[PDB]
Amino acid sequence: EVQLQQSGPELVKPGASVKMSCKASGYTFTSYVMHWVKQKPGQGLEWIGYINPHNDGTKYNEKFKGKATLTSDKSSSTAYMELSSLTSEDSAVYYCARKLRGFAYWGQGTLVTVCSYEFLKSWTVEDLQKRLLALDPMMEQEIEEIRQKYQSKRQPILDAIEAK
Amino acid sequence: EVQLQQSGPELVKPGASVKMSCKASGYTFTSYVMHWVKQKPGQGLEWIGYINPHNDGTKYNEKFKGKATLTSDKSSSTAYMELSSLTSEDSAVYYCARKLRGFAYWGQGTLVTVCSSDYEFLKSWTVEDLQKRLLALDPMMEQEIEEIRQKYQSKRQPILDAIEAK
Amino acid sequence: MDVLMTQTPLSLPVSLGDQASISCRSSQSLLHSNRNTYLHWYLQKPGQSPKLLIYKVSNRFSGVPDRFSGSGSGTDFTLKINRVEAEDLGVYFCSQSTHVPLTFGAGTKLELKFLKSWTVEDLQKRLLALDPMMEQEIEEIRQKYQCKRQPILDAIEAK
Amino acid sequence: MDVLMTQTPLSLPVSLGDQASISCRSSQSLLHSNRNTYLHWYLQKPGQSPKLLIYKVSNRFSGVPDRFSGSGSGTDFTLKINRVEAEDLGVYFCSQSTHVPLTFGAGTKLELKRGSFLKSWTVEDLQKRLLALDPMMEQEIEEIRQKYQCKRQPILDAIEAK
């Protein structure tokens, strides 16, 4: 089975760089051009560019010259994309996809989150640690609300199945 | 009536400065301290600081020390906020609010949107290519707005139905 | 270390008439040395400005309906809605001014979990609550396209 | 200049079994000089990756249901669905590769006006739909997890530096 296996989520500060990976298996890596697409959450697909692993040739959307750098390594059957000097406009899911007659095979996508300090130096060490721990139940509260939202949506389907 | 009338929405390139105003009417401007508060949508409100118009004294949230400067003007009955060197993280609604027991009175909010970086590659376009694209944004905007309008007509209709043949 | 304000639940489904309870917890006691406790409760409808409901834990602000009540002490406070109305839907948050800096809780959504059992007044209130919601989203679009217009204008004006 | 792709509508509500039709207009014609018309259709279910539906206006990719058909020429193309089913809900994008850079439409969301005739669904479709909500929940939870990751970072940075 063809699989485009992309690297896990990335957590970056503004201005940093991130290099992500797309490991193909189940076909001859060098026989196909590898494309990359950006998708900001809740918005459209943007085409970044491609690399041809057979000869390392690359093409870039003008909207991404300098922002993205595409490479590949034949021995590892892996395509890489490096994004430089990140901003909040770069936080998005990044997909690799194999093209022949179109984008038939897609990776699962790599999520890049660009986060934000000073004033915290006024705090004591114990005050920082207590606040770090207070974050954990706060996360769980948010996640538990999401879980219940989806429990509500599932139950009528689950009921229709039970009453078959 | 007491009213805090804030200046309209702002569009800022990052790293710049922006100054907004909070025009008080219907009470003695100097008698009450004016506060400022930030709200990014879906985030909680953060207190920025206050200005005391009676003596021009201020206090700042340490988190916004260096980001905001509060001023006031008696003759204008107006409080101001300047935000310095905006990043995308400064995109938010900013309220002014008068305090006594709590914030009984709030301005309507100034919306500050920090833009992006596209000029880089756009300098290579022809003026016609540019002017044709600049115009193509107005149909794209109207289509998005009409999506919003329809989404809300959907929410209105069951309510309007209940009202009709009530 | 400023005082952290946490609320429970994050979302509360109701129908018009039930009791609602919204809890607010502080990381530090809000009892001031002057023996007052500066904890306040607010309501913000989406697309609107917040409005003061309760000050000093249990004092109803002038004009707020009597079905609203608040209580508590030290680090733990409750807001209660006795028989919820339609104009009460929206976001409730607490605030503290005992300690500098002033801090707010992030808010509890009182939502609606049938419209024919409502009165025409209630339906009219609910219909009007949709207007600031729509204008909020539309203005967001209008500003987005402003940002979109700038880079082209900057290039055209550079010839 | 990049080719603009306009999709209409932006959101399209239907009921299961209805006919859906989705339009896509390109700011310049998609007929290549070598005479192929490189227009493609994709469906992306929420929380999932896009999948190819049609290539070159009207050719269904190997495995795509018969109810999907594509048509058009030059600047105007339509995707049609005969008898919409629950697994067809999602975001349909059009794309063109006649011109460089490759470009996409903004997307058309196909959703339910107000849904349920649930007892008339087959067992398969009911359980398929449950499976369809699982990545929708994973994306939303992943979002909270990465949000709190950012909230932890400056605090952990401050701890190490004290």
Author numbering:
A (entry chain A): 4 to 119, 123 to 170
B (entry chain C): 4 to 119, 121 to 170
C (entry chain D): 1 to 113, 120 to 165
D (entry chain B): 1 to 116, 120 to 165
Extract from the study:
Anti-DNA antibodies (Abs), serological hallmarks of systemic lupus erythematosus (SLE) and markers for diagnosis and disease activity, show a specificity for non-nucleic acid molecules, such as N-pyrrolated proteins (pyrP) containing Nε-pyrrole-L-lysine (pyrK) residues. In the present study, to gain structural insights into the dual-specificity of anti-DNA Abs, we used phage display to obtain DNA-binding, single-chain variable fragments (scFvs) from SLE-prone mice and found that they also cross-reacted with pyrP. It was revealed that a variable heavy chain (VH) domain is sufficient for the recognition of DNA/pyrP. Furthermore, we also observed that the binding of the VH domain Abs to pyrP and DNA was significantly inhibited by NaCl, and that the mutation of arginine residues to alanine or asparagine reduced the binding of the domain Abs to antigens. These findings support the hypothesis that electrostatic interactions driven by the arginine residues in the VH domain Abs may be involved in recognition of DNA/pyrP.
Finally, to investigate the molecular details of the binding of the anti-DNA Abs to pyrP, we performed X-ray crystallography. We first attempted to perform crystallization experiments using the VH domain Abs DO1 and DO2; however, they were not crystallized. An arginine residue (R97) in HCDR3, an important residue for cross-reactivity, was observed on the surface of the protein, giving the Ab a broad positive surface potential. The presence of such arginine residues was also confirmed in the antigen binding site of several anti-DNA Abs. The X-ray crystallographic analysis revealed that the arginine residue in HCDR3 confers a strong positive surface potential on DO1. To investigate the possible antigen-binding modes of the Abs, we performed the docking simulation using Autodock Vina with the DO1-clasp and ligands (pyrrolated peptides and DNA). The results showed that the pyrrolated peptide and DNA mainly interact with the VHs of the DO1-clasp, especially with HCDR2, HCDR3 and FR around HCDR2. In FR, W47 and Y50 interacted with a pyrK residue in the pyrrolated peptide and guanine in DNA. In addition, K58 interacted with an aspartic acid residue in the pyrrolated peptide and a phosphate group in DNA. A docking simulation analysis indicated a similar binding mechanism of DO1-clasp with DNA and pyrP.
